[PDB]
Amino acid sequence: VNPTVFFDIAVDGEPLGRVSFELFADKVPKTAENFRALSTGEKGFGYKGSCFHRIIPGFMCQGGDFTRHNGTGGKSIYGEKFEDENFILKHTGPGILSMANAGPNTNGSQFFICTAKTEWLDGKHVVFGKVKEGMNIVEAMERFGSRNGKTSKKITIADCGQLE
């Protein structure tokens, strides 16, 4: 019953591949629903065409700022940054999908995909999904990041939506 969504990734406009995610609506419904709705674009805005603006190899790939494209923007589907739903799920290794934020109860649209275990983030960032297929595509993306997070090529969500 948990929804599956996909991102089709491009690198400087060239197709790279598809990453799919299981979203844990059973455990974090409000947080899963935000991401799913942003991924389909059914509210009139969302992830399609946005970039991964911060990528640090061995740590994580961050995206979801579809409004300012640099980590200063993004918005939820709810009309105003939302609460940390719960911290049931932990940052237990590569593939974990988690909400970026600006402190307690400030969730918008930005997220990260872990490429390692990042337990120091437990209790600070709401984990709400996990890569189901295409972790190799995330690994290929990661190689275009750098120590300070700046990417050396433009990493884009060329298309996205819900699978079934």
Residue numbers in the entry: 2 to 165
From the manuscript:
Here, the effects of radiation damage on the conformational landscapes of three different proteins (T. danielli thaumatin, hen egg-white lysozyme and human cyclo­philin A) at room (278 K) and cryogenic (100 K) temperatures are investigated. Crystals of these proteins diffract to high resolution, which makes it possible to fit alternate conformations. Here, the conformational ensembles of three proteins subjected to increasing doses of radiation were examined for signs of damage at 100 K and 278 K. We found that crystal structures respond differently to increasing dose at these temperatures. At both temperatures the conformational heterogeneity (in terms of the number of alternative conformations) of the crystal structures is at most minimally affected by dose.
CypA is of special interest, since it is a well characterized dynamic enzyme where minor active-site side-chain conformations, absent in cryogenic electron-density maps, help explain the catalytic function of the enzyme, which isomerizes its substrate via correlated motions of the side chains. At 100 K, damage was concentrated mainly on cysteines, me­thio­nines, aspartates, glutamates and main-chain carboxyl O atoms. 2, averaged over all residues, against dose indicates a highly significant increase in disorder at 100 K from lowest to highest radiation dose: around 20% for thaumatin (p < 0.005) and around 35% for CypA (p < 10−6) between the first and last dataset in the series. Because this type of order parameter is based on alternative conformations and B-factors, these two facts together suggest that the dominant effects of radiation damage at cryogenic temperatures can be modelled by B-factors. We confirmed that, despite the faster decay of crystals at room temperature, many sites where damage is concentrated at 100 K do not appear affected to the same extent at room temperature.
